[PDB]
């Protein structure tokens, strides 16, 4: 995995294991994803091709 969004640029040598959604917009997300409610993590793809 890796991350696409975070509150701010992490400091050097810090571990972030947070899960809360990142509010790109002023819209409240209330713990549930939606439009402008971006889940931070994203998986990769590792095919032999």
């Amino acid at each position: 995995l890796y991350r696409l969004f975070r509150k701010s640029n992490l400091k050097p040598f810090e571990r972030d294991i947070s899960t809360e959604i990142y509010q790109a917009g002023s819209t409240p997300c209330n713990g549930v994803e939606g439009f402008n409610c971006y889940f931070p993590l994203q998986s990769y793809g590792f095919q032999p091709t």
Partner: nanobody
Amino acid sequence: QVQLVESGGGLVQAGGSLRLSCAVSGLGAHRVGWFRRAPGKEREFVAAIGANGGNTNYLDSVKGRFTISRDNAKNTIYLQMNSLKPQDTAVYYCAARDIETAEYTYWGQGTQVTVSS
């Protein structure tokens, strides 16, 4: 491009368990989500699962009796309803993300599931 098709939507009696399973073409690079349209409301989040992932998010209302799964073999995702409370009837849509900017990249045609009390 990748395409998703929804099947398995139909009326169920109160308390029934119907497993909503939508097929996906070329799954694996994407995370798929389940949203439903209330009769007078717009889509809201219910379930989503990342490939081979244990990352699970659910709405508090649908919490406690829903689970989502990804088979990894037939490229189809499975959502199980368990004893739906009648007001929870809605049309569920499969959607996927490549790089989410506004919402999920693709929207499925969806299906209708309804419950009689």
